[PDB]
Amino acid sequence: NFLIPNGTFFAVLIIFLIVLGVISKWVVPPISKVLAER
Amino acid sequence: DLNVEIVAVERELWSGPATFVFTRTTAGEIGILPRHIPLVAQLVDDAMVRVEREGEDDLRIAVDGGFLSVTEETVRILVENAQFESEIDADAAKEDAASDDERTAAWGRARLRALGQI
């Protein structure tokens, strides 16, 4: 019965969320800037 | 029967009734019979035509610029140039066959195919 939704559902989200922030600042914006510069 | 009217650019090459027509379209070999559905077709660069007529040996024609159109009444082959078999010379056709010139190679191959040597 492991397929029942678990509190882990919430926890993982936060992880993902914080990761997004990095890709929102230090991954995608620099790449867009360098591509536009090229 | 169906009327084949082979019309070359510089001159109406031939016209007459016949029973069956065989041609090499881009999609593939095509046979045309009296009441064939109307259509339009390219003929391959190395195309060829074979007309089977009533009481006469089938005529084999090499064609460059072959461009077929079947109507409700007659079939017309608009052609840049065409050669009947009884006028082509094998040595010239083979000499110019498979040349680096795509047009020359295609025309020579069509000539050889009309001759039947393939």
Partner: protein, 84 residues
């Protein structure tokens, strides 16, 4: 229970499967062949006879199997093999 009843039920279900599969296959294959024939007739009416003969062989390849399955009806429903 009486084993003959179980064997009869099993044979009934087996024959049902046999003929039903045969029927599905025959119907679908005949539809495909008829589509081919209809398209060909639309394409070139003068090939009528030339078109009729190949189609029949196709039908022969299909119907026969169906009939073969139908044949096994006798070997299943009536001549119940293994009946004790």
């Amino acid at each position: 229970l009486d084993p003959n009843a179980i064997i009869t039920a099993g044979a009934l279900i087996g024959g049902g499967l046999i003929m039903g599969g045969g029927a599905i296959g025959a119907g679908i294959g005949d539809g495909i062949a008829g589509n081919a024939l209809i398209s060909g007739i639309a394409r070139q009416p003068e090939a009528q006879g030339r078109l009729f003969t190949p189609f029949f062989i196709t039908v022969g390849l299909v119907e026969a199997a169906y009939f073969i399955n139908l044949a096994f009806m006798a070997l299943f429903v009536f001549a119940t093999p293994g009946l004790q």
